[PDB]
Design a protein around this ligand. Structure first.
Ligand SMILES: *[C@@H]1O[C@H](CO)[C@@H](O[C@@H]2O[C@H](CO)[C@@H](O[C@@H]3O[C@H](CO)[C@@H](O)[C@H](O[C@H]4O[C@H](CO)[C@@H](O)[C@H](O)[C@@H]4O)[C@@H]3O)[C@H](O)[C@H]2NC(C)=O)[C@H](O)[C@H]1NC(C)=O
Ligand SMILES: *[C@@H]1O[C@H](CO)[C@@H](O[C@@H]2O[C@H](CO)[C@@H](O[C@@H]3O[C@H](CO)[C@@H](O)[C@H](O[C@H]4O[C@H](CO)[C@@H](O)[C@H](O)[C@@H]4O)[C@@H]3O)[C@H](O)[C@H]2NC(C)=O)[C@H](O)[C@H]1NC(C)=O
Ligand SMILES: *[C@@H]1O[C@H](CO)[C@@H](O[C@@H]2O[C@H](CO)[C@@H](O[C@@H]3O[C@H](CO)[C@@H](O)[C@H](O[C@H]4O[C@H](CO)[C@@H](O)[C@H](O)[C@@H]4O)[C@@H]3O)[C@H](O)[C@H]2NC(C)=O)[C@H](O)[C@H]1NC(C)=O
Ligand SMILES: *[C@@H]1O[C@H](CO)[C@@H](O[C@@H]2O[C@H](CO)[C@@H](O[C@@H]3O[C@H](CO)[C@@H](O)[C@H](O)[C@@H]3O)[C@H](O)[C@H]2NC(C)=O)[C@H](O)[C@H]1NC(C)=O
Ligand SMILES: *[C@@H]1O[C@H](CO)[C@@H](O[C@@H]2O[C@H](CO)[C@@H](O)[C@H](O)[C@H]2NC(C)=O)[C@H](O)[C@H]1NC(C)=O
Ligand SMILES: *[C@@H]1O[C@H](CO)[C@@H](O[C@@H]2O[C@H](CO)[C@@H](O)[C@H](O)[C@H]2NC(C)=O)[C@H](O)[C@H]1NC(C)=O
Ligand SMILES: CCCCCn1cc(-c2ccccc2)nc1N
Ligand SMILES: CCCCCn1cc(-c2ccccc2)nc1N
Ligand SMILES: *[C@@H]1O[C@H](CO)[C@@H](O)[C@H](O)[C@H]1NC(C)=O
Ligand SMILES: *[C@@H]1O[C@H](CO)[C@@H](O)[C@H](O)[C@H]1NC(C)=O
Ligand SMILES: *[C@@H]1O[C@H](CO)[C@@H](O)[C@H](O)[C@H]1NC(C)=O
Ligand SMILES: *[C@@H]1O[C@H](CO)[C@@H](O)[C@H](O)[C@H]1NC(C)=O
Ligand SMILES: *[C@@H]1O[C@H](CO)[C@@H](O)[C@H](O)[C@H]1NC(C)=O
Ligand SMILES: *[C@@H]1O[C@H](CO)[C@@H](O)[C@H](O)[C@H]1NC(C)=O
Ligand SMILES: *[C@@H]1O[C@H](CO)[C@@H](O)[C@H](O)[C@H]1NC(C)=O
Lengths: 749, 748
């Protein structure tokens, strides 16, 4: 049938029931459901009856109930004989619930109020593979020191992952099972790591001891250093028997000195995180660098000496021993100048593909040094000074750094990438790119660049294919701009509105036609409303034009003809975005002059009161039409007369009060119709008049003010009979009248 | 209570933009000025104003609002005192027939009138001001304007005539000599003869701009004279224009200005010559000797296309402009300004404003601004220094008329605006040899430096400093402290480094200012500070903290910022709008300065507000909680404040009003409950023994139930007519249907 209140669907069966304002566990769930997600509802109480007839559930998620404490009686879950993954995060739980099923393999209890880790609660769960207990007591939270009953984990003999981070521990719990692979103990106020602490865990691949004896200067959180800001104290033989270790996080442990012999017996170490320490000394001289022959990722970010600004970065020769190194991060070291000889030790590494020098206030760089490298793919120099919920930190993300790729992947994919974003390159000199290697992806966003590009500024790197010049203040006064880059495929000129705003300066966009291979052009949020000389955009190649956040309302205004064909010369164009252009009306001749090659057309978030549906006869490839967030007052009754290509029609956030007789099913093409957040109070039988298939497989109707009287029943039978038409969010397809039905789903009466 | 207009005296009916479909027949019969603009009115007849004799002014602009306005012959003619009639933007195809002989002002701007006729105009002999601009222009489909010979001749009191933006081709003959102001911009007149203005001895303003326009880079469809020739003005065309004060010749494609045009023009004060081709004349400039009483000279946008000369070339004869107060040279385009290039201007005694905006200037020898007698405004924005219808028919077409520098900044003294330049850091000699500057603009220079307490030492008296839209790195606690006289500091939109956790942010310098009155930290995304977590000043009166992250600063797991504003002991005004606050901790709220009079927490997401806590705020006059998610008010609000005059609660989720709330506090003049969820206002809500001192209660936008029991509130309204409820048309019944859309003030 049609499931309510959850949306149920099957994979190699999952009832997503989240964020639905549910007051208690709905009882109408399907029977063959394996994975239920009740996250973000308003459930206050779980008992042994809440999931009575669903013994085929292997996964329940009750995270963030009740959002804006959750009461769970003992053994509530005890009957669920297949339950393996139980997620109870962010629930103000005061203790680990009693009587959890011996079946559990995964138990998350992140972001609760649990300070007593106890055998009664945990020792029964001998199938546990992952247990997450992070973030129950941290920062200035009002909470107790955490109590870990002795030997509480030693039963958990297939335990592979244990996370106790952001809890007050003081010391590494004794008696962990040697099954452990991943041990997270970040920000647990442990000052001292003894020889005994992990002697037994011979399978460990990840150890996280970060933020114990933190470096607190400029902490974005309440930060409590060890006494005299001292180093975490790691015993000489603490990592002796950790032969399988692959991931070592030692960020913010106030390290000044690394004991090289710590790495003696972990020659498979792949990822070493050493951010926010005091290692300027160790970076220039460290022995430990010789002990890391398989290391792929080394993170030394934010080791700057406070108030210190050395002229040069000082890199030990021993970096030349890091033969497997793939990515080196050296943000926040802070130094003025980068010279060829400062990086000799890295030049011979065969796999060094990422070098990250973000946020170092670098003033000058000798670009020729990147030339002398095996296979640099990513040169990240963003944010230097080159010149011509309810909690703040995601419990599931890295705490010390953003985890996203450095360069957008769609740019990096083209080849070698140079990111000079967020510098002070306000003008591109004639030699600013001399001695660079053959860059394919270049980022110059947010340099306050205010110049007049003219066909020569990129001569030294003519093979750029993806060029980001967003958030600058370019002065488009020359028609040869960027014409030197004849392989250019993607050009992003978003947020260069500064000069476009000014009537009196010129604005030349002619250079666009000069590329034989330009595919994607983003002119968004430029406030374009007047151009000089040539009023039209032209390209034989261009496939996608993004023109959001401009002033087509002025370009196409009734008293001016000059821009009536503005986009017509884009002969290859399939995708066009005209959103956010304050259009109240589009002149018919202007709509007719959009390229007939369009398959996708967005005019969302404007101000349209009317739309000439007849004009779609001229767009025989048009598959997606998006008119969301306008003021449209009705629809045409003749849609099938005007297109046989349209598959998706998005009409949400408009003012439609009536759906025409023979609308739904007369148009063969249409798969997906979105009428959410309109002014429909019913749907007439006659709009449901049916042909073939109807082909409609998705119809959105949430947010309309349906009159839930016996009038609607025609539509209800229709839904009942056309179960191939997915209606999402049934709990939001709600009745506005009369008062007895007000606020309920239309499906529930 | 008037309806549907809002009425008031000195008697004026403000009835605009109200969705009305006919002229209302329920307008007070005393009303003298009536404004019905922006309504949906389609028809006007001799009935529409039948009971409103005594009307002196009617505004019908822009009806119907989103065909046109149909007006019958004689519709208005029974209105015998009617002086001002405004009919702009109504798609009138003709001047309406049989208008009353009493009219002194008639405005027909923005219609489809291409025929000016005696039948329409010639008996309207009391006319002082006739506006017919913008009826045919650009690529509008419209006809060349036909002016019946002599049509203006009987208008012998006509002082102002505006025909701009119509296709005229020639100056109309037979203009009455009572004319003071004649507007003929963009009328396609290529030639001015000696006859055209021969009798106009009272003219103080002539506007001939946009005839033979300079079309290069035009922001509108532009049609040049052939060859781009200049307007052709006869040597004697201004013989008798002895009273002329304003002459506008912008965009007339002038290469050469004939000095003799000014032979008989001793009072010219304002001369506008933008968008011509006058680079040569600026250098040679015979005409200048003719204009020793001129006050304003606008020479902006005379740049030669694709010419970037090294220097500006200013004729020595500029020194004859002895009454010049303001010189505008935007858009000349030149590389460098040397002292010798402005010699001619250095002895002009009243030259207070020099405007060099948008010239792409790279180097300025700043010491040259000392040899000036009394420059008050040095405007150098937008250079290059280093270390319906598009146009408003009531505004200048060739430039914005706002002030160059903000008045609040210029009022302090000499002013220097280097906004939108490329001063990405202030070098150590960036300001030497400047005049004693009191108002300084450095907005939008992409400045990224660590200000450290010496960068402004050569202009140590600045009192208003604008550093907006930069990317400053707040890493030295002595930044700006060399400005001991500083009173206003704007640091808005410097979010760049503020949004990065790993860099330092030191705001300690705030404390060092003995005279700091206004501080703007808006839109900086402030969420973390280094070492010192508190703002402190003994002087500060106003702090703007909108668009930051108080949600993070005061989150529940961190206490370091719980007194962030307590040390602002003198503060009266505080804006916490736009900080994504879902809740304020009680301790953080009680730590706001006890001295506050005006507190804004609008446009957050506050679900709850602790009203109790207003006990700690005995000077609190204005509290703004608009644009939140508040579900309710307290029961006993007088228990908590005796000072509150204005409470703004619009756009919240309040559905029930507490007993006696409308008279509960009695310091309160303004209560705004618009756009909430009130269905009605119960009897218990109006119970008091105190007299209410409320004078404005706002309720539009609540979904009222218009059943018979809204009667009690209707009665209270009827009884409390001192309590203004504006916008009664929008105080609307949500129910029952068939009462839907109607103002609660109707029915049973
Ligand atoms: C110290 O360094 C260590 C070693 O790098 C670091 O360990 C990593 O922590 C992250 C953060 O939890 C782990 O990432 C998770 O891995 C699981 C398992 O596949 C994913 O499901 C998670 O993704 C979900 O959540 C994300 C964020 O909300 C979403 O982006 C996504 O939609 C998912 O729903 C998440 O990636 C990571 O696996 C470990 N690394 C290893 C190898 O185990 C540790 O965090 C550092 N310590 C601190 C305090 O930063
Ligand atoms: C060529 O130069 C001349 C001389 O400078 C210039 O004449 C000026 O035109 C403007 C634009 O109309 C006039 O400004 C108006 O003056 C009246 C009367 O005092 C005001 O009502 C107007 O203000 C209303 O409208 C404004 C804009 O909507 C609103 O901001 C304001 O709040 C009011 O509602 C308006 O200021 C100006 O008076 C004349 N100057 C003189 C001395 O008479 C002419 O515009 C120039 N020509 C072109 C095409 O630019
Ligand atoms: C940074 O914050 C500062 C300080 O708040 C801010 O400067 C202030 O801007 C306001 C404008 O919002 C100025 O107040 C105006 O002053 C004029 C001039 O006389 C008055 O006409 C105004 O009153 C009318 O308009 C108000 C609404 O704007 C109505 O409230 C009023 O009833 C009238 O209709 C108005 O009060 C104030 O003078 C300045 N202060 C200073 C010192 O300049 C600055 O704009 C902010 N910066 C940025 C970049 O946003
Ligand atoms: C300027 O416009 C361009 C082109 O539209 C923007 O780049 C495009 O960004 C969209 C996301 O908005 C990308 O689509 C996404 O790609 C991923 C990766 O396969 C996919 O998982 C997502 O579901 C989605 O489809 C698209 O690839 C990307 N295109 C290019 C050529 O980069 C760009 O972001 C806009 N610039 C700015 C500043 O907004
Ligand atoms: C060029 O650099 C800019 C600025 O660093 C990058 O912009 C960031 O993009 C990410 C990825 O989506 C956003 O989530 C960040 O918020 C952006 N930061 C800012 C300040 O805008 C940009 O993506 C880079 N361009 C490419 C092609 O890699
Ligand atoms: C300093 O310079 C900036 C930029 O020229 C001025 O900002 C403009 O202010 C006006 C007038 O209020 C606004 O209408 C414009 O939109 C603003 N433009 C920009 C780019 O922000 C600023 O007001 C000047 N400051 C002072 C004190 O004069
Ligand atoms: C990695 C972050 C270092 C924070 C301290 N610091 C240092 C500077 C700075 C250093 C050198 C030049 C200019 C500025 N700015 C700041 N904010
Ligand atoms: C006043 C308007 C001039 C318009 C043409 N122009 C000229 C320049 C330019 C000139 C000289 C240096 C840098 C830029 N930029 C532009 N856009
Ligand atoms: C370099 O990377 C290649 C390809 O992934 C891999 O085969 C090899 O192990 C790496 N070389 C070294 C010395 O680690
Ligand atoms: C760009 O193309 C146009 C016409 O297609 C041509 O006029 C112009 O010379 C070209 N400019 C170059 C290649 O720099
Ligand atoms: C049209 O677009 C496709 C890519 O979508 C491309 O292969 C082709 O070269 C384009 N046409 C021209 C003439 O460039
Ligand atoms: C659609 O456009 C054409 C002009 O292209 C026009 O003739 C027709 O009247 C228009 N239809 C509507 C409803 O505007
Ligand atoms: C012009 O300046 C002179 C000399 O400084 C002064 O005497 C005179 O009063 C000023 N006149 C005006 C109108 O400002
Ligand atoms: C407190 O503010 C007022 C208002 O500006 C001012 O008069 C007084 O001097 C201020 N306190 C100082 C400057 O210490
Ligand atoms: C508001 O403030 C008082 C004093 O801090 C507090 O104790 C009271 O519980 C709060 N009110 C609400 C509704 O939480």
């Amino acid at each position: 049938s049609r499931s309510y209140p959850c949306d149920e669907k099957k994979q190699n069966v999952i009832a997503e029931c989240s964020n639905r304002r549910l007051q208690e566990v709905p009882q109408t769930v399907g029977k063959y459901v394996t994975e239920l997600d009740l996250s973000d509802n308003f459930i206050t109480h779980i008992t042994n009856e809440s999931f009575q007839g669903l013994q085929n559930l292997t996964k329940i998620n009750l995270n963030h109930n009740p959002n804006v404490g959750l009461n769970i009686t003992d053994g509530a879950f005890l009957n669920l004989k297949n339950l393996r993954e139980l997620l109870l995060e962010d629930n103000q739980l005061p203790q680990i619930p009693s009587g959890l099923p011996e079946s559990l393999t995964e138990l998350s209890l992140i972001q609760n109020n649990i300070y007593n880790i106890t055998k009664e609660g945990i020792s029964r769960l001998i199938n546990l593979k992952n247990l997450y207990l992070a973030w129950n007591c941290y920062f200035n939270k009002v909470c107790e020191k955490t109590n870990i009953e002795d030997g509480v984990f030693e039963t958990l003999t297939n335990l592979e992952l244990l996370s106790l981070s952001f809890n007050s521990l003081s010391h590494v719990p004794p008696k962990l099972p040697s099954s452990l692979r991943k041990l997270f103990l970040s920000n647990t106020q442990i000052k001292y790591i003894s020889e005994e602490d992990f002697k037994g865990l011979i399978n460990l691949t990840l150890l996280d001891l970060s933020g114990n004896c933190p470096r607190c200067f400029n902490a974005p959180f309440p930060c409590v250093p060890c006494d005299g800001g001292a180093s975490i104290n790691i015993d000489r033989f603490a990592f002796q028997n950790l032969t399988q270790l692959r991931y070592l996080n030692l960020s913010s442990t106030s390290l000044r000195k690394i004991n090289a012999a710590w790495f003696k017996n972990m020659p498979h170490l792949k990822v070493l995180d050493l951010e926010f320490n005091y290692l300027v000394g160790e970076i220039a001289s460290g022995a430990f660098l010789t002990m890391l022959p398989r290391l792929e990722i080394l993170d030394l970010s934010f080791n700057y000496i406070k108030g210190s600004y050395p002229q040069h970065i000082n890199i030990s020769r021993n970096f030349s021993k890091l033969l497997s190194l793939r990515a080196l991060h050296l943000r926040g070291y802070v130094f003025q100048e980068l010279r060829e000889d400062d990086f000799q030790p890295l030049m011979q590494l065969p796999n060094l593909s990422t070098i990250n020098l973000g946020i170092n206030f670098i003033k000058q760089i000798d670009f020729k040094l990147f030339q002398n490298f095996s296979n640099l793919e990513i040169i990240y120099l963003s944010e230097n000074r080159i010149s011509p919920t309810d909690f703040e930190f995601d419990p599931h993300s890295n705490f010390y750094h953003f985890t996203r790729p450095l360069i957008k992947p769609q740019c990096a994919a083209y080849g070698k990438a140079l990111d000079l974003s967020l510098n002070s390159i306000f003008f591109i000199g004639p030699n600013q790119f001399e001695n660079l290697p053959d860059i394919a992806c270049l980022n110059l966003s947010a340099n306050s660049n205010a110049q007049v590009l003219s066909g020569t500024e990129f001569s030294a790197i003519p093979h750029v294919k993806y060029l980001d010049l967003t958030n600058n203040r370019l002065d488009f006064d020359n028609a040869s701009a960027l014409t030197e880059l004849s392989d250019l495929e993607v050009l992003d000129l978003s947020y260069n509105s500064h000069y476009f705003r000014i009537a009196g300066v010129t604005h030349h966009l002619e250079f666009i036609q000069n590329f034989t291979n330009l595919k994607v052009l983003n002119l968004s949020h430029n406030n374009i409303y007047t151009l000089t000389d040539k009023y039209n955009l032209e390209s034989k190649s261009l496939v996608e034009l993004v023109f959001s956040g401009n002033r087509l309302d002025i370009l196409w205004n009734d008293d001016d003809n000059r821009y009536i064909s503005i986009f017509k010369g884009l002969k290859n164009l399939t995708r066009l975005d005209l959103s956010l252009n304050r259009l109240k009306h589009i002149p018919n001749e202007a709509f007719l002059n959009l390229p007939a090659s369009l398959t996708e057309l967005h005019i969302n978030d404007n101000m349209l009161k009317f739309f000439n549906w007849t004009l779609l006869q001229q767009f025989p490839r048009l598959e997606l039409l998006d008119l969301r967030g306008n003021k449209l007052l009705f629809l045409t009754d003749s849609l099938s007369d005007f297109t046989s290509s349209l598959r998706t029609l998005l009409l949400s956030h408009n003012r439609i009060s009536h759906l025409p007789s023979g609308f739904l099913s007369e148009v063969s093409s249409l798969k997906h119709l979105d009428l959410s957040s309109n002014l429909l109070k019913t749907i007439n039988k006659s709009a449901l008049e049916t042909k073939t298939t109807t082909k409609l497989s998705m119809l959105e109707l949430h947010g309309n003010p349906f009159e839930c009287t016996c009038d609607i029943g025609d539509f209800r039978r229709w839904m009942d009979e056309h179960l191939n038409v997915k209606i999402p969010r049934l709990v939001d397809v709600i009745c506005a009248s009369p008062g007895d039905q007000r606020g309920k789903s239309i499906v529930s009466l």
